[PDB]
């Protein structure tokens, strides 16, 4: 069947930037249509770049033969430079002594309507997140829970970091069952800098209760350096517009945010832990 590694979400109504089969034991590759390689025992790098007015939407690599190893233990594919939403990325994939062949297809969508709000949301986001996994709750306090079937890492206390299908995910802080989803916001590449902030309504029925962040970021190594995302100030009832700043060690490529509102919320959410 093959080992399929995914970056981004596949769309059935789009076109592919290119598609090529690569012999991973070749030294070096064949420069197909003008793209360079770097092949080693432990690494395979494709310095792909396109000459079309479009932005990368997804990447899928199929490795042969199929080897029974879970793909959620570590990360295999990542665009070292650029990534999803750009026109080119330096795609790095780490090989094994058994994998000897690869089949790389890359998809791009027109740069005009270069948005991903139509594929990462789904039909009902109330019970299912972007990962496609259902929400699980606990009866101790009627709130959410934690998932332990994917790749996660922590740096400080009460820090959540998830990585799946090239998606980096975080939740601040926790979500209640009775809350009703309002809407979402997206950030394009042209609106992304080293540091940037957001402004959200926090009045009447738009009282902020829970937020989640999904993004695509670059890596300078197999182990990434997570951005330092921290809330500034207090999202209290007095200040009508709540704000949040982002500090990044590595430049981001895409950003998606979902808004959860509950008028009965007190503006603070933290377990009885120390």
């Amino acid at each position: 069947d093959g080992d399929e590694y995914f970056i981004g979400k596949y769309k059935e109504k789009d076109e592919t930037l290119f598609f090529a089969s690569y012999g991973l034991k070749r030294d070096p590759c064949q420069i197909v249509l003008g793209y360079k390689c770097s092949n080693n025992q432990t690494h395979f790098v494709l310095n792909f770049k396109t000459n079309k007015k479009s932005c990368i939407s997804a990447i899928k690599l199929t490795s042969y033969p199929k080897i029974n190893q879970n793909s959620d233990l570590t990360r295999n594919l990542y665009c070292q430079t650029g990534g999803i939403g750009t026109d080119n990325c330096k795609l790095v994939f780490k090989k094994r002594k058994r994998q000897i062949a690869a089949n790389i297809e890359i998809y791009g969508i027109p740069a005009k309507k270069c948005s991903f709000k139509d594929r990462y949301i789904g039909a009902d986001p109330l019970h299912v997140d972007s990962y496609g996994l259902s929400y699980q709750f606990d009866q101790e306090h009627g709130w959410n829970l934690e998932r332990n079937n994917i790749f996660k890492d922590t740096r400080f206390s009460t820090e959540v970091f998830y990585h799946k299908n090239g998606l980096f995910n975080t939740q601040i802080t926790y979500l209640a069952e009775e809350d009703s989803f309002s809407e979402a916001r997206e950030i394009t590449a042209k609106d992304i800098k080293k540091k940037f902030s957001i402004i959200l309504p926090n009045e009447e029925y738009k009282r902020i209760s829970f937020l989640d962040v999904y993004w695509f970021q670059e890596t300078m190594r197999k182990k990434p350096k997570y951005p330092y995302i921290h809330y500034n100030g207090e999202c209290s009832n007095e200040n009508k517009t709540c704000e949040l700043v982002f500090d990044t060690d590595e430049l981001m490529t895409y950003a998606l945010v979902k808004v959860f509102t509950n008028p009965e919320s007190d503006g603070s959410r933290l377990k009885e832990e120390d």
């Binding site: 070749r26 064949q30 000897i100």
Partner: protein, 176 residues
């Protein structure tokens, strides 16, 4: 005992070598030049020392339009088979006075490589210096990082050290 000369290129396809002589002396240098649209891989400026081999990697001119690449045409060895697709095999063999060490025939693998080692033309006087022998033994046995000998998880390895009691040296209980 004859003067040390150096193997003449039996062929250098898709390019030229400068200069061309019936025999090459010690420390003589050749510049390997490719034709147009062929990319060079290996040492262009090659001088062959007293060991009898040219310094550096074998110079190859490749166009990069096949499943696998040109395996090269080593000096003194001549290649039969210009097809570099999959399941295609090429044949290597040496000229008069030269013995082939490597693969008599290399078949392109489904991974994108060739099955076997790169052939070379050798003589009776030629010996491999201990330093490169140790380097190649380490490269084949270990994996560079330092170096390590990895194995399958929950697995071990076995070594079979085999010696010859021939009537050549066999002195003082394998001294050394």
């Amino acid at each position: 005992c004859r003067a040390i000369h150096c193997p003449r290129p039996h062929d250098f396809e898709n390019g030229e070598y400068w200069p061309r002589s019936p025999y090459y002396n010690v420390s003589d240098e050749i510049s390997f030049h490719c034709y147009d649209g062929y990319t060079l891989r290996g040492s262009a400026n090659r001088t062959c020392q007293v060991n009898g081999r040219w310094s550096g990697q074998t110079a190859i001119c490749d166009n990069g339009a096949g499943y696998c690449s040109n395996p090269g045409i080593p000096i003194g060895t001549r290649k039969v088979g210009s097809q570099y697709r999959l399941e295609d095999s090429v044949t290597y063999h040496c000229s008069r006075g030269l013995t082939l060490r490597g693969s008599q025939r290399r078949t392109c693998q489904e991974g994108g490589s060739w099955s076997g080692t790169e052939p070379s033309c050798q003589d009776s006087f030629m010996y491999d210096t201990p330093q490169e022998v140790a380097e190649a033994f380490l490269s084949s046995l270990t994996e560079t990082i330092k170096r390590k000998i990895v194995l399958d998880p929950s697995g071990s390895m076995n070594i079979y050290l085999v010696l010859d009691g021939s009537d050549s040296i066999g002195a003082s209980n394998f001294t050394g």
